[PDB]
């Protein structure tokens, strides 16, 4: 199937409580595989998935050098952004960055990404052409000019189309037993009376991987979008995910309702009903 790799960086200032914390995490699809935390007793890149443990000491040293240097770069960046927005030295601020590559079912590059936010607001992003930037405001225009001067976009494009794709393909092969295994949802429909004349029908999906799933309720074959209560997909902690969708139905009308489940691990999409 389709796969992606992403690195997620968070740098957070904390005036009066030491220097800003820098944390980086790396993911292949919904599986985290590495972390670096500048607050750790001994900051080092650490494995977070069993299939990355086979990487050599050169890999871990290379990651750690990059992340240790980024801790410093991001502390300078937080000082710079505070200046660009004329902010006081008193408040806590956050820079987030996410970048990586997407591959399609043939393993070919679909597109690259690089996006940054300041205090949870879009700040600067590399355009889909991997050659130009979109700056949100006059502060981000300063960053845009610096990055043009250092020829950042050219270096980032070469990484996104090269190393990023090559390492993602290596991880997908090393981790094929889990990363390329889609686990279908285990499903069931529960019934809970709400009153003498209404009841809740809840459609469950448990134990699935990846997180992407479609769970909907239909009444006489028509989608019940506005009347469906749909919980955010949640992690079970064993790599798998969980989700439910619920509808409040008039008593005696339960068989007019069907729950539809679409997921990559299923041999066929499911049509479920309440089974008393």
């Amino acid at each position: 199937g389709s796969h992606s790799m992403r690195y997620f960086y968070t740098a957070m200032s904390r005036p009066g409580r030491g220097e800003p914390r820098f944390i980086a995490v790396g993911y292949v699809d919904d599986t985290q595989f590495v972390r670096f935390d500048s607050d750790a007793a001994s900051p080092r890149t650490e494995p977070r998935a069993p299939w990355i443990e086979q990487e050599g000491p050169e890999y871990w040293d290379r990651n750690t050098q990059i992340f240790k240097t980024n801790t410093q770069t991001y502390r300078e960046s937080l000082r710079n952004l505070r200046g660009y927005y004329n902010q006081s030295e008193a408040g806590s601020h956050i820079i987030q960055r996410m970048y990586g590559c997407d591959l399609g079912p043939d393993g070919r590059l679909l597109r690259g990404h690089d996006q940054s936010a300041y205090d949870g607001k879009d700040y600067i992003a590399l355009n889909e052409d991997l050659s130009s930037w979109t700056a949100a405001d006059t502060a981000a225009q300063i960053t845009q000019r610096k990055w043009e001067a250092a020829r950042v976009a050219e270096q980032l494009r070469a990484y996104l189309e090269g190393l990023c794709v090559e390492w993602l393909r290596r991880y997908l092969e090393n981790g094929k037993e889990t990363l390329q295994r889609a686990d279908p949802p285990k499903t069931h429909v529960t019934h809970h009376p709400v009153s003498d004349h209404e009841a809740t029908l809840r459609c469950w999906a448990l134990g699935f991987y990846p997180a992407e799933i479609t769970l909907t309720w239909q009444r006489d074959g028509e989608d019940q979008t506005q009347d469906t209560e749909l919980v955010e997909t949640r992690p079970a902690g064993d790599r798998t995910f969980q989700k439910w969708a619920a509808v409040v139905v008039p008593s005696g009308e339960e068989q007019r309702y069907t729950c539809h489940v679409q997921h990559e691990g299923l041999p066929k999409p499911l049509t479920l009903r309440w089974e008393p």
């Binding site: 992340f67 980024n70 940054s116 600067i124 990055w147």
Partner: peptide, 9 residues
């Protein structure tokens, strides 16, 4: 593997 080029904002 992460991107190795350092560039401050």
């Amino acid at each position: 593997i992460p991107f190795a080029m350092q560039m401050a904002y």
